[PDB]
């Protein structure tokens, strides 16, 4: 079910648990969350952990 402990909560990057309600996703510096509420997207030209030439 929908918890961070289960497969990072289905979140692409950061996952957040709350006590009564379902887990929420988040993103790293320079990334932000997409409409599926799980995936991240760069809000910069060179976000960390991405290799330019390989994309």
């Amino acid at each position: 079910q929908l918890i961070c402990v289960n497969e990072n909560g289905g979140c692409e990057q950061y996952c957040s648990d709350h006590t009564g309600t379902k887990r929420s996703c988040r993103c790293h510096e320079g990334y932000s969350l997409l409409a599926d509420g799980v995936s991240c997207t760069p809000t910069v030209e060179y976000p960390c952990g991405k290799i330019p030439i390989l994309e």
Binding site: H28, C40, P47, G49, K50, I51, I53, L54
Partner: protein, 247 residues
């Protein structure tokens, strides 16, 4: 790097080369435009504190191809719980004098959230380590991470040995064929998770390089994320060596 392939120029853009008066000191890790993460033990000997250089976009140490970016090291920050002669807390944070300009060839490595690292990154089977150790190219390697209790059980016992501590972790191979090495000290142990790379370890120590029945021991970065994030917002200080308290 024993038994590794060449890292195709560009595929390791966070790799840092550290120089003191031109002499090769260590490898480091870029995390943003201004900060670098390397091993504390790299600075044991250092006398001439004012001649440190961090080199980025570097690939082949035998030719300047233009992409190289060199910055003076304004500061070396080390935990107060690190003490030379002991392998524990082997981590150093380095501020640069002026920022680096991010290119196709100079990109920072993500520094993950403590929880995310311990919960998810700690269990990604394989991670890449890299370092330089006619054509002096950057070398990369794929090592499997082992949890401490296995690492001890799989390791060949010696009379005099350091404990693997809550600030270390073992990755690598027992058959004596592949390993990081002294010259790679401070370099990234980089972990891919769902399309992004994150720093999980620092080349810390090992029993020789690629010795049979021995693994490479890495600094467990997840322990230092709050310690690093806090210090990256800290105001510039007089002097190069700073011994910030841990935790």
């Amino acid at each position: 790097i024993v038994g590794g392939k060449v890292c195709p120029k560009g595929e390791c853009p966070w790799q840092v080369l550290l120089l003191v008066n031109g002499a090769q000191l260590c490898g480091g890790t870029l995390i943003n435009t201004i900060w670098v993460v390397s091993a504390a033990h790299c600075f044991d000997k250092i006398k001439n504190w004012r001649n440190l250089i961090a080199v980025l976009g570097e690939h082949d140490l035998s030719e300047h191809d233009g992409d190289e970016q060199s910055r003076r090291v304004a500061q070396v920050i080390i935990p107060s719980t690190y003490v030379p002669g002991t392998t524990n807390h082997d981590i150093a944070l380095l501020r640069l004098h002026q920022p680096v300009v991010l290119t196709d060839h100079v990109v920072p490595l993500c520094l993950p959230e403590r929880t995310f690292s311990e919960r998810t990154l700690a269990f990604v089977r394989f991670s890449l380590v890299s370092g330089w150790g006619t054509a002096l190219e950057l070398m990369v390697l794929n090592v499997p991470r082992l949890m401490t209790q296995d690492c001890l059980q799989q390791s060949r016992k010696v009379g005099d040995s350091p404990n693997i501590t809550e600030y270390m972790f073992c990755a690598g191979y027992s058959d004596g064929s592949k390993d990081s090495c002294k010259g790679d000290s401070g370099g990234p142990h980089a972990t891919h998770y769902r399309g992004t790379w994150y720093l999980t370890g620092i080349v810390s120590w090992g029993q020789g390089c690629a010795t049979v029945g021995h693994f490479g021991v890495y600094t467990r970065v997840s322990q230092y994320i709050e310690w690093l994030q806090k210090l990256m917002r800290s105001e510039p200080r007089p002097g190069v060596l700073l011994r910030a308290p841990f935790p």
